[PDB]
Each structure stands twice: as C-alpha cells, then as structure tokens.
Amino acid sequence: GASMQSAANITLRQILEPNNVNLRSKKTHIVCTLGPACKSVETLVKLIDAGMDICRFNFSHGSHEDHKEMFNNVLKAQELRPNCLLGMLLDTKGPEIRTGFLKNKEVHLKEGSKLKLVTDYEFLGDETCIACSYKKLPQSVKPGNIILIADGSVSCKVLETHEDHVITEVLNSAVIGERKNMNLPNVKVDLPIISEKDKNDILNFAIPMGCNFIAASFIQSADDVRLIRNLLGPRGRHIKIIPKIENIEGIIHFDKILAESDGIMIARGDLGMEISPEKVFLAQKLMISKCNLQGKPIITATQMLESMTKNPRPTRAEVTDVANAVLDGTDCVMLSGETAGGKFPVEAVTIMSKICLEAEACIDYKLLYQSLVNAIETPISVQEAVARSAVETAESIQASLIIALTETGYTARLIAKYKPSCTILALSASDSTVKCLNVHRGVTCIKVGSFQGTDIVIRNAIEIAKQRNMAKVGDSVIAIHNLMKVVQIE
Amino acid sequence: GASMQSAANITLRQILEPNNVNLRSKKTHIVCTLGPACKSVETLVKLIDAGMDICRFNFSHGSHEDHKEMFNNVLKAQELRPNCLLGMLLDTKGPEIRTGFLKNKEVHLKEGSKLKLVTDYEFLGDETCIACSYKKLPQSVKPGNIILIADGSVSCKVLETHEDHVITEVLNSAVIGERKNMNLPNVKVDLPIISEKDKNDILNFAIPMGCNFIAASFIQSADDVRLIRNLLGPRGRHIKIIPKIENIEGIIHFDKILAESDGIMIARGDLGMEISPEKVFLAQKLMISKCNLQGKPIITATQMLESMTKNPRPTRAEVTDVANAVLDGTDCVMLSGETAGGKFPVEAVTIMSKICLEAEACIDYKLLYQSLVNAIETPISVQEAVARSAVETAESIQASLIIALTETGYTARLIAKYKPSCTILALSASDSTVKCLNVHRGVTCIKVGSFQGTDIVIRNAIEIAKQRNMAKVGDSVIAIHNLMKVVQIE
Amino acid sequence: GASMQSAANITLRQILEPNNVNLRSKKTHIVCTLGPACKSVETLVKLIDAGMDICRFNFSHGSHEDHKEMFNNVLKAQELRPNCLLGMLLDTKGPEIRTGFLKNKEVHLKEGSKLKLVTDYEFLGDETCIACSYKKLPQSVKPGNIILIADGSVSCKVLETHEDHVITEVLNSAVIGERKNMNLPNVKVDLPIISEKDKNDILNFAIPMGCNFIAASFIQSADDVRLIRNLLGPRGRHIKIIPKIENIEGIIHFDKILAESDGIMIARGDLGMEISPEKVFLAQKLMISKCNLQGKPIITATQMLESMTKNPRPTRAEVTDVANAVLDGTDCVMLSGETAGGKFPVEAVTIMSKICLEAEACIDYKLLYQSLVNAIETPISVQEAVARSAVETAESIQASLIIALTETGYTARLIAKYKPSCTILALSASDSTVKCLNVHRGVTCIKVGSFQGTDIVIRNAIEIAKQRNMAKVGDSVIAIHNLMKVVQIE
Amino acid sequence: GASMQSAANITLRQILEPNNVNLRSKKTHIVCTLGPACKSVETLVKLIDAGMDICRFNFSHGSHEDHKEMFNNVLKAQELRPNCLLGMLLDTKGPEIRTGFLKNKEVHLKEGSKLKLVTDYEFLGDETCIACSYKKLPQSVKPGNIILIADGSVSCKVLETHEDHVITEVLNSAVIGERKNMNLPNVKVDLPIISEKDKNDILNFAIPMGCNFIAASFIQSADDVRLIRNLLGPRGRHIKIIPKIENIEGIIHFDKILAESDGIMIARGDLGMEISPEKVFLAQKLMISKCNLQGKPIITATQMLESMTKNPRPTRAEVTDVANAVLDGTDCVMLSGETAGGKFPVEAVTIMSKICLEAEACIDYKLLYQSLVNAIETPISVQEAVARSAVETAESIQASLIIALTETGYTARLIAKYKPSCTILALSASDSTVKCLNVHRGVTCIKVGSFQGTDIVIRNAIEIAKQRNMAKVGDSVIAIHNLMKVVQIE
Ligand SMILES: Nc1ncnc2c1ncn2[C@@H]1O[C@H](COP(=O)(O)OP(=O)(O)OP(=O)(O)O)[C@@H](O)[C@H]1O
Ligand SMILES: Nc1ncnc2c1ncn2[C@@H]1O[C@H](COP(=O)(O)OP(=O)(O)OP(=O)(O)O)[C@@H](O)[C@H]1O
Ligand SMILES: O=C([O-])C(=O)[O-]
Ligand SMILES: O=C([O-])C(=O)[O-]
C-alpha cells in the first residue's frame, strides 16, 4: 500500500507560449536503448544534443562484439560533447523466453494464420514457423492458451500441442524481428535468475568495459540482488544494481528488493504480459511512490513513445504517459525500440525532453517539498538535514543551483530526494560517481581534480555554470559540503 | 490558471487480485464512435455489455443513409438491452480540411516517396496523388512546411507548390483510408463554424432522429455556441451542446465557451495537430479541472487506445492515458477508430471499462469531496447544499446508492458534481433527461412510467436496483427530493 | 493524551463596534451556584436576563430546607420568564474535608498569626481556632506541611501536631466564611465516594425535587459513576450524572470515567489544591478535547471571575480565562462564589455572557467542523450522519436555526457535537429532556405537547422563533427527524 | 484582521509528573516591575533565580533617586549572577490622569461611600477626598459617569460636578495607595504624548543610566514613535522604543505604530479601562498574531497574577492567562504590582516561570514553523532564508542550540521570528545588543570580545554552553554567521 502524485499549476501562457529552453537543462533523465538505428557516432552526438543521459545495452540482443563497438562509439561521441558524462547500463538476458532468428530478419504475421512454434533454437524461421528459446514449451502450454509475443504486440492462440512443437493461430497482424520476448500463461518458468550467459555478460563485459549499472531482468527477491552483488565481487564494487520489476514475485517482494537495490526499473513490457494490462498503472504509481519516499532512483520503462518506431510524432496517450510518469515522480523515463531499431530515434529523444520540460514546469515545488518532509520520519541524519536545508533555502531565495561537493555522490543523492526546483551540480573527482549520479532526477555532474581546493572547485563550477547558461550574474547558488552557504554569482 | 489530480490509494491487493465486478458498474462513461466495424446489432449488443454509454455519429464520415441504418440498429440493440439507455451524439463536420476519396478506399503511403495533393475533391486518389477539400491549399502552404494527416500519424514535407496542386515528401510509412483530417501549418482557415452542410445534419438528422448531444467541431467562441442554440430552436430545446476544443481559439476563449456550453469535448487529435504535441497534456489537465469546478461534464477524446485498431490489447502508454484521464476528473472517455474502423472494437471497450474500474477504485473519495468543497464558494443554493450533503452522508455511512428524483436532471447533475463513491440513480419520466445524464460521471437512469407517490417511486427503484445487483438487502440508500433521507433496503 | 484549540478570526470592528445582541442568544451556557446573594425571585429573574441556564445547588453548604426554598424560588422566577427552562444541578458533599462554623460568620485571618485547628466539628470558631471535619487530621499531617483552604486562597503551615488538634501559621491574610474546603498534603482521605449523607441528598432531594443532574464530587473511577447510577435507580433514570474531576485519580481514570458519565465538570478549585496550580491548565485543555471528541458536554468551573465577589468588574486574567474556555471548546462556564455569596452576582453573569458572545464571534465554524469530522472515524451511524449533514447544510446556506424534534434528546446531542454556527432548537414533549439538554453548547429547548404532529410542531417552533427574534422571514431553517429538510420562513 | 493560536500536545505524563527543571531554561521572558517589595539586592538575586529577564522602572511612581538606587541595586545583584544579563526598561508617565498623594499613603475606599475628587494635586488625601492630575476633570464628567481607578479595581459613579471638585459614589470596597491610574468616560484627554517630565526622564535617566528600552505610555501614532526616536538622538540610538497600546487610537493605528517600533507592550490595565473588558482578549490575540507575523517582540502585561499581591499562590484564571499568552505567541509576560508592592514577589516570578515552562512543553514546533512559513510570502532575503533553515535543521536533527554570531542582534531576531524548540544562543561584542535581545522569546546572550575570530568565539560559546548545561557532549548545534554550519559537541 501507498498514496500519490505531485500538484500541478497550468496557465494559458504555458499552453500557448513556446518553451525555448535547452533540452539538456531538464530534470528527468533519459535512458536510451542502443542498437542499429543509433550505432553511428554521428547519431550518438545527436542523441546527446536531444537529451540522452544513460545508455542501455540490451544483452538479450546483438553480440558482445557489436555491443563493444556501440560502447566505443559512445566514448567517441563523449569526446565531441565534453560537457556530457553518460552512464552505461548493461541490461541482462535473465530467465527470458524468446522467439528465434528469421530468414529475412522480419516476418509479417497475419491475423487468422497458423504459426508453428518449434524448440529448435538454431532454426531460421518465417511467418509460417518460428522457434522458441524454451525447450519445455510443448509440455508447458495447453490448447486455448494465449502466448504473448513482443510486449504483447502479438497474441497467439494454442491450437494443438505436440512432442517438439506447438501449432498456434495468430490473433492479430504484426511485423516482428528476431529474438522477441514471449510470455507463456500461468507457466512456472524453470530458469535460473543468473545463467552462465548472464555470468559471462557481467564478468566479461560489464566489469571490463566499465558499466555503471546492471539492470537485472526478472528479479524476484532481495536474495537475487545479493547474488549479483556477490557475482560482481571486489572489481564491480562501484557497479549499481537496478533490479527490473517484470513479474508477480517482483511486485510481492518489492519493499525488500528496493531495500537491497541501488534503484529500480519498472519493466512494464514483460510486466504487462504477466499481469492484466489495466493492473500495470497501479504497479507503476505504487513503485514510484515507494522509491520517492526511500530516496531511491526509479526508471519508468517500455512503450512510452511506441508509435515513434514508425512515426516522427507520438500519439496523444504517449505524450500523457511521459508527462504523468514525470508528475508521478519518476527520476528517469526510457526509450527502447524507439531508439534501438526505430525510424526516428532523435525525434523520439527530442519530444521526450520537451514533454519532461513541460511537466516539470508545472510541478508545485513548494508543495512537493512539504509532502516529502511530512512523509519522512524525523530525527534524520545531519547530512540529510543539511541536504534538505539546501532545497528549502534554494526555493525560498529562487537560487539557480545547488552545488554539492561529493566523492561518493551521497550528498547529491540526499539533495535529489527532496526534488529541488533548480539543478543540482554534483562535483566529484571519481569517474564512477559522476556517471552513477545520472540515474537521479535533476543531478548534473562535473568531474573535478582529485585533490583540489573547495573554493576553487566551486568557482570553476560557477564558471562552467555561466558557460552552460545554467546561472547568470546576480543569481544565488547554494554550496554544500557539515555546512551550507549562499554565494552570489559575479 | 488551475491546480489538480485526485489522490490514489494503491494496495498489493488491487494489483494482484482479479476485479470480477460488472463492466456497466463503472462511474466513468464511454463514448463509442460507430462505423463499419460495429454496424451490426450483434456487435452493438456486445459493446453495450462491454460498457458503452453514449453513441457517437461522425458526420465527417459515412452518409445520412449509413447513419440512419446505424441509428436504427442501436434502437434495435436497446430493445435487447432494456436496462441500458444510450445517449446519441451527432459530431459535426465543422470548418474541416480533409483528404479526398481513394480508388481502392485505402492507400499504403511509404516513407521517402512523393505525394501530389490536388484541389479537385472528385479525384479518386492512390499512393501518389490525393485530393484536398481546401481549394486554397497551394496558396496556403510553402516549401518546407509539414502537412499533418490523420491526427498527425502521417507527416508530409512540402517540396514544391504549384497553382492547382502541391508536391510533398511522405516523411513516414502509413496506411490511410478516405477523408482523413488535415492540419495546414500556421494557416488561418477561411471557413464558417456552422456551414449549410452542418445545418442540414442538425436540422434533418439530429432533431428528427432524437440526438441528445451536438458535439460541435472547432468551436472558437461563446457566440458560436449561442449560434447553435438559436439554430436548434424550440424543436431541439432538450438537445445538449458539447463544444469540441481543438484549436488555439477554443483554448483562449475556454472559460466563456464553458459558460455557454452543456459540457466539453477535449478533441486531442486536431488540437495535437494545431499546438505542439507536448502541450496537449497541459490543455487536458486544465480543462478537466475547470469543468470539474463548474460541474460541467467533460469527454477526453482521441488516441486513448489507438494501437487497438490492429491489436486485441493496448500499449502501456494507452492504459495510463485512460487511467490518468479518470484520476484527472474526466466524466467520459472516448473511442474513435478503435470502435468505428478497428479490428477489435469489443475488446477495446472492455479494457477501457476495466481501466476505469481500476482507476476509480484508487480515488480517496473523502479527500476528493473535501477538495471540491474547498474550491467552491459558500453560500451556494439550498439545492446544491442538499446534493452536497447526500454525497457526504453517502460516504459517512457507506451507502450503496444516491436516488435522485428529477424531471430535468438538475438534481442528478448537482450530486454528480460532488463525485460520490457510490452510483447516482437518476429517476425521471423524461426520455431526453434519461439519455442526457449519460454524460455525467456515475449517473445511471431509470425511466419512470408515472409521477405517483414519492415512496412508491423510491421502492420500485430499489427493487430494480436489487435485480440489477447495484444494491443488496441491508444496505443504506440516500433519497434526495428540498430534502434528503436515508433508507434501509428490505 | 490529545491536541487542540479552535480557529479565531479577529477584525478591528469586533474590538471597536459594540455587541448590542440579547445575552440569552449565546451558545455557551452558564451554570450559576445559588446562595444567599441570589435567593430572591427578583434577583433570579435578573440572573435569567443576564444569561443563567443551569442552577447549582451545593449540598456542602446550606441545608435541605434552604435548598428547597431556593429551588421553589427558581420555579417562581421561571413563571415570569416562560421562554427560559433551567436545568437543576445537585452538587454532592462527597469525601470532603471542611472548615467549621464560626461565632461571627466570618474570620479575618492575618499573615503570621497562629491558627489552632480542632476536630470538634460542633465548635463555633474564630481567628485563633477553627474546627476541621476530618477527625484523623492531627495524625494525617506533620510539621512543615501546607494545609490549603478555600481553593488555596488561604495557606497554613503546620507548626505542631497533638492528639486532638494542630497548631498552624497563617501564611497570608484572607477573610473566610464557614465550611470552606480544605486540602491536606499527601493524605489519601479515608472517606467514601458516596456517604449516607450523599445518599440522602440524592434520594431525598434530587429525586423528589426533580433535579436534572448530579455533579458528583471527587469521582475516582467508572465504578463510582455506576454506584451513583444504581443508587438513582428506576426513579432517577432521567437524572444525568456529571462526575467532577478534582483529584489525581479522576485524571488518571478520565477516559473510563468519561465513558460512563453524561458529561464532565472540571472542578478546578480542589484539583488546583491537589495538583500544582501550573498543571491545571493542561488538565483543562485535555479534558475539553476528549469531551469534544466524544460529544460529551463539559463544564469549566471555579475562580473564572473570582475578583467579582468584591468588584463590579473582573481582572484582565479573568476575561481571558472565560474567553479561552469557550475557544477551548467548553459547553458551559460556571460561577460559584460570584453568584452564591458575592456582592455583584448580576454583573458577574452579565459580563460572562458578554465574553462568551465575543469569543463565539471569533470562531471559524467551517474550520471547526472540518477538524471534528477529521478526528471522528468513519463509518458513523445513519443518525450521527444526518446530524453531521444538518450542521454542514446550515453553514453552507447560512441557516438561522437547526430544528431537531427529539424525545430523549439524542438527536440534539448529535448535532451539538458538530458545533453549528447557528442555534439548535430542540422540540420535546419530555420535561426532563427540555431541561437536561441545557448542558449542551448551543441548544435551546421548547416543550411541545405529546399528541402534536411533526408539521404542527415545526410550524409552532418557527412561530416561536420569529417571536423570540431567533429567525426572521426569508431565512432558511434545517429540520431533522432519518431525514433532513430545508424550510423557508414565510 | 488576523487568524491564530499555537497547537498544544498534552499527555497525562505532563500533568502528573513533576517538572523540577531550572526556571531560567524557559523561552518566554519575564518583565518585572521593580518597587519597594523588591528593593534589596538579596530579593533581586532571588528574582533572577526565579526567572526575571527585564527590569521595569515605572516613572509614574517613586523618585528619580529611588529609581537610581534601585538601578544600582540591580547592577549589584547582576554581580552575584554573572551568567544573567538583564534588560533595563523605562516606563514613561505619558498623557496620564492619576489619583493624588495621601496623608496615610494608603486608604480603604468602602462601597456606597461618598468620595470627593479635587483638582489641586498638592493635596494629601484620605478616604473622603482624593486629588486628580487633570484640572479639566469637572469640565469633563457628568452625573452618572463611571470614573475608573487602578485598572478599574475601583468604580466611581458621579453624583454631582462643581468647579474645583466632583462628588462620586465608591461603587465597591478597595484599599488603594498613591498615584493610581484614572480613566474618564468618553473624554478626549488634552495632554501631550511626551511631556517635559517625560523628556527629562528619557534624557537624564534612560540615556545616562543606560536603559535598553522605553515603554512609552499611551502611543497613538507612528508620529509619536518618530518623535521619541528624534529625542533619543544618536546618543540613545541603541535604545528600543516599545510603544504601549492602551487606547482606541493605538488599536486603530497599530499597524503603522508596529511598523515604526522595536516591539509592542499590550498595556491591558489602561486598555481594559478605555474599551469594554470583554473586548481586551480580542485586542491581545490580534496584536500577538500581527507581531509574530512581523517577527517584532510583544510583551503581555497587567493583572496576570494580580491575586498574588496578597496570596503565595494564584487563582485558576491567572494560571490560564499566563499559559494562554505563551500559547498565543507572546515573547514576554509582565509583573506589575505582584513584584513592585506585593507580599509575595519571588513566588509570583517562580509560578510565572513554572507556567511558561509548562505551556512551552505542549507547543508543536514542527507545526508552528510550518504555519509561520505559510503565513510569510516568498521570495525572502538570503539572511531570512538561512535563519529559517537554521530553525528547520535544528528541529530535524534535535539540535541543542542555534549559535548566532551577531553585532546588532539582526541574525538572532531573524531566527527568533521562526520560534525554534531549542535555545538561540546570541553572541555579540556589543553590550546594548546583549541586553536588548532579552525581549525576544527563547534568546540567551553571551557577551564576547570584539577582536576575536568567529571560530574562537564559537568554541568559547560551546565551552560556556557546556558549563551552563545548555549543550553537552554528543549534541549537534547550529552555528549561523551567509552560512549555516552543524557542529558536534566533543
Ligand atoms: N461513420 C463512419 N463510417 C466510416 N468510417 C468511419 C466512420 N466514423 C469513423 N470512421 C473511420 O474511423 C476513423 C476515426 O474516426 P473519427 O470519428 O475519430 O474521425 P476523424 O477522421 O479522426 O475526425 P475527427 O477529428 O472529427 O474525429 C476515421 O478516419 C474513419 O476512417
Ligand atoms: N447554598 C449556599 N449557602 C451559603 N453559602 C453558599 C452556598 N453555596 C455556596 N456558598 C458560598 O459560596 C462559596 C463558593 O461556593 P462553592 O459552591 O464553590 O463551594 P465550595 O466551598 O468552593 O465547594 P466546592 O469545592 O464544592 O465548590 C462557598 O464556600 C460559600 O461561602
Ligand atoms: O525489460 C524491459 O524493459 C521490459 O520488459 O519492459
Ligand atoms: O475531432 C476529434 O475528436 C479530434 O480532433 O480529436
């Protein structure tokens, strides 16, 4: 249980006058799933200009080599955009059930047609016959059952179950590519949380490549989170674990999963295949509420701008979904197929930033802070109080920035919890910190020198803030490191 | 200048437990647009069972012939569903700009290909050449301009402009049928709000057929409402006027439009094409808030479950759009192409009812009553105070129903304003009242045969309520008629 | 414990413009202790005119015959004021320690002088030697102890202890009469809750004379209240038990005492002698809150306008004490020595009415209603719901009266709990009801005939209301009997 | 116009358990009027221990030499108590009307006795004839007029008026001394705001002796305040002007008077004689509410514990008066005759401190700060923001103190406005600041060295706070000087 959503203030002015502010000045961060549509350095720079903050590498697709290439192109895109430090997110395979490979890379499934599902996962399929990664499929499904494919974009009714295959009837026309996700109704999937393939993805890519986050697919318990932490060991001590909530067990054990985790991802695609589509908005709102209360970052994911895979504009529902995720209190929003395989990756990232800018602009921050402080039980730590004091002071004097000097990012995470109206400028001499803080709403990072003076580091930040149009002369800034001070910009 | 959104109480119970209640028990009413996909009595009966409350007739499509056949098949579906009293809504053409007629009724437009937009509206087009209703189109657009087609699901870049035609580039692949809506960028449309074609539809369909509402397209002022009211005359005195807000002028003059109107339609499709898409959510939240304060009913429309024109289940953004429209304070939600030309009309309506039930079970109704009461100024009339108290009493004792005895529907309209947790049972002898109240959230009507004893009317209504499983023996009911009484079911 | 005090609104015009209103129009009711100072029918009539609602007969003073003569003078006063129905309250002796009788009816005790305390209670004393009613006095005190007399107005330090007597030092100058109350420090009084004399006062005066309330001195448990209820028996079934909280045991067991009681008296005199004076204001604010939350009436008693026993004007502290008792939420305020023995009984009652009216005019009834409704947990009974709804409907339409037709008084008590801005006119055929309801803030009673109908009764009530200037033509009145109706005075 | 009162939290524990805490640890400060009852150094030392914070010298009484010997005795007492820095308050005569001098210095006026009131102020009166300071007296009052004496403790009905005297009837029995204040009914007193006697008192006592405050009698306008400021000149620039509101003119112009002043004194004695006594509680609450809003200090004065001039313990009304002034939001409470001429001055100050501590113990500081912040419009100055944050932080971490380094007292006043739960420890090099901040609730000063750094002054303060047990090992303290730092006591 929980109670929700931030108070809005909408004027005619907001609806009619254009919001010409920079797309990178927004508070909500964007997770972009990388793939063929945005592989080039040139597209990665365009995505940075449009508002990309975190890069998602889905290990359910591609290969280590193709992911290694995309990763290095991101590093080259960062050399072209020095004021942008991107977080690197590895999204695991986990205990997934997938469709197979295809002869012509795309099949055009038609409503009313029969589709045979085979267990030979090496088989290159076509619209008449496709493979399933799950060898127990014939024994697991029964005639009448609805197999869901690609976030439920395809529904198949089981007609007959055999020894090695299943005959289905396609219930709707859809075009799908390779290795689409699947859901088998009321089937207890006999698959480990961490497979040998997951182990090779984490140890042989995540740790050597320098990923900041592990988005663990299908987490069911706090024990699963500890298992990954242990797998990561001493070398991966700075890699954050973001469990993905996408099954009933993740919902039931949410509170404990959240306690062990470094943040959460609401994996609505697979979740909306497991539970009734109408139940997902409840699960979304509940999980955001809880995360906001614990000060843990949350990523709202999947089918946010779905139509944008084919159209340069989103539907009406898609706009409200992004806006309402922001007003619910999400730290991040996410783009999946819209960036990885769609026709308009840049225009998808662009309008998402515009929707975030609009939604953030009508939030009632004075009220938002009051509602947080009322929910959080006091006494609180000295660090939390000073962090909170910074947010209230910033709001009272209409300060442009909160500058936090932090090695671990702890101070910045504490300020972020109180959702200030202004940007948080986290200043750190750690490379993991400056990229890990990207998952927290409204936190912008500057990488500083390891043993540099408090006041010189603050002036260099003010100088970069002036250089980035974040603050002008005459403005006030809050500086925090246990103390808080108000500096007038000059 | 508004402030909004109701408080949600979400438990694990709500997420995980199946809701097995009747689809017609929901408070949010559904407007279905009728068309070829639901032309049969069998299908029209399935939509009634699924939760349809108001039938929409888009006079921009079909013919007077096709619409008469449709109207009469609804009357036939009602004979089979006597506990359901549907409202009939005529949606005007208005000062619209449309794509013309097609050779094979449907075309597959492809990304990067050229499209010739001609001004001869008799030209049966193909994927290379399509007619445009606004003869002034070549002199109205300029090279580089983005023409929007079918709620902006098709974007066209003007390459060159000629005397009688325009040459564009199809910026995305899309399949479109006949008479798709068009938006011309920054063009002041020289067309009347009420045309001769519109007058013929109102005077020779709406009045003879007995339409309960006029959804007036592209309303820009209160004088346009006054105009339709005077047009309707005495013969159409019980017909409600529902201005559609779908342009900048409709937004600017919203307050004056609202004051003259009988309710509002948020026509997001054409509005989303007129203003930047990211600004539609702002418009929607502001208008719902303003209507909620005035006690005027509001219909949230377009692209609510768009993906369901092809798939038997919606996207994650579609589910939240509906849920959020309900939590915003909308009275009705609408289906356009999802029921008119879609492949899954019955499943579209069904999931829409399920999302409404799920969102309504969230609302903290005691907090919602308090916020309405705080935002309204005391003193109010004796009539409003008694309606207000019926809602408060109903909530305090957890009453099953609020039974309103009303000729006009005014009492039911007042109770509905205070949004109670239980159903408002509106008892009227008037056929127009009974069918008009369908636009107010949570109002269910019984048509009474006479105006006998005040206690016989109430007793017979409880007997009907019990049979319909709305009320059970031992429940309390509130009866309002100026007084309020609490009655025990026996 | 609890949390408290109602919202005040002070304008300059309230401070400067005179309050010309009738003194009996106030909501807060006055309890006047009757004695030699107000024995005459002539004075009792002026006391009615100055705002007296309940008469207190202190059985610690006088005699049965003297109390009977006064009671019959109250009945003659009421014949001259037929619009005034006084409640009769018997205050029991209880387990009290009293000073004796005096040779000259008064003693002028001088600071520094020695005072001998004797145990022969038949001895008429003087300035040098006064009797004490507690035989165990010399064995109950030790040298250095401070004996408090007359609400702590006299302090005596024990110098020496002997078999049959005690020698003390008068610590302050004071003039005192006979049978003043006493407090012995750290003494658990070896006296019963109800003595044979208390039994005789109850059964031989309260039941035969027809008293409406028993204010029981020194109640320590719910067992004491049940003892009294059983002592009253069938003949005393309509007599209300108002326990007096005047010792630690009464505070410790307050919640259980309150549950059995029909109301509470904050007997601040003795309580102020038993506990530290600074602690009494805490006890008072807590008790009023607990009573207000239960809908049980409370009387704030003792030393409210003390200085007015000698002066025609009160002190600044005395005015704030009365005003603050009203804002705290007391139902009644009491005058003890101010009316029973003082030099200005009429001017004491006059100013008390005037402070009450001034403070009642500060109250924000909308905020007061909201607070109570928030504090009381739902579901509430249908009866309590319609009572609550009559309060809200009256405030919403600015109604002049709440007309409640009740036999037992139950309905009027339910309305009185939600503290309306307007008077509650209770109509009852029961003579006990009509006199008992006086202890409730804002309730005015009219005795109706047993065989009169609802319409006849509501019409005569409205007629009396016009005659009494309680309501005028054009005003709205709420009538409740389970239903609520709004009536226009014509 | 205003709305008010601080929310209480009372438990049985606070009522039954003894609070044996140091009387100088309270937040509310005490203003003591010095007179013959407390002339000795030994008594002044006991008054300091009992909780005296400001010394009032009423120049309406005694001689210039009497006040000087008194001031010197205060200076001597302060040498025995060095951890206590008292404020010196001069109370002017103003445009006052007084009773004359007596040949027995104290007379006993009896009820129903005739009294002559002469205009020759050189006459030594008895109970049959007393002098008046207003020569215009028999040309200002008519038969039936009630002349008031000594805060209205004596009422005098005019029997007849002549040329040099009047004949009145003593309406009550009272013993009075020399120079008692007087109020003439509906008479416009033709006297100056500051007389030549007031001029000599301000210029030849307040400036040379070093008074910190001037409580100016009967201030009517902002022009009167500006006049005193002009008189005080640059020599007395550090002297605070505390206007006394004791007339209709002072209430009508309170806002402009408050704007010009350094604080306010609610002079209830004369005020209660000018307006109806039942209206004084309205004035008190409105004025406190307003002063609290502007963060200006307010003193609640007269008859707070009046009965204590004769008794070692107070009335019930007196306890609620002090307690309720604290809960209303008063900075100081004052003692007049209780300390200047009474029989029990030490016990009066003791009980006053005990009531303060009790009232302060039930204040909800988190709710108080919330209400203050909501009542003050944003943006505010950086100085007010930081000060506000010191309060919020202190409450969040349960800090022991707020240490404010301030030269003028500006910082400490800004903190005092937000009423923290912990003591404000103001540190200043200035002697006037240290003795002026006493008028602000919860402020304690330590006088520091002028040429010492911030960090040496803070660690010295901590060691003094430790010695006084105002802070201890393990505590958090907030240090403010524009910044806020949280210091751990080690
Ligand atoms: N009566 C009808 N007959 C045939 N097709 C219809 C009918 N009504 C709607 N449609 C089809 O469904 C689609 C969506 O319906 P809808 O009523 O929303 O029309 P529209 O083109 O979007 O215009 P508008 O902006 O007025 O709603 C139409 O474009 C059309 O293809
Ligand atoms: N009926 C009476 N006859 C004579 N004197 C009375 C009477 N009632 C009260 N008094 C006088 O008024 C004073 C105050 O009255 P009060 O009723 O408060 O009694 P009390 O002595 O204070 O005892 P308690 O604690 O019951 O109030 C008494 O002490 C007595 O002097
Ligand atoms: O993995 C995801 O993001 C999902 O399933 O939605
Ligand atoms: O007309 C409509 O309904 C629209 O444009 O959304």
Ligand SMILES: O=C([O-])C(=O)[O-]
């Ligand atoms: O009996 C009383 O009223 C008292 O003691 O205060």
Ligand SMILES: O=C([O-])C(=O)[O-]
């Ligand atoms: O002067 C005063 O203090 C008064 O009148 O109260």
Ligand SMILES: [K+]
């Ligand atoms: K004076």
Ligand SMILES: [Mg+2]
């Ligand atoms: Mg005075």
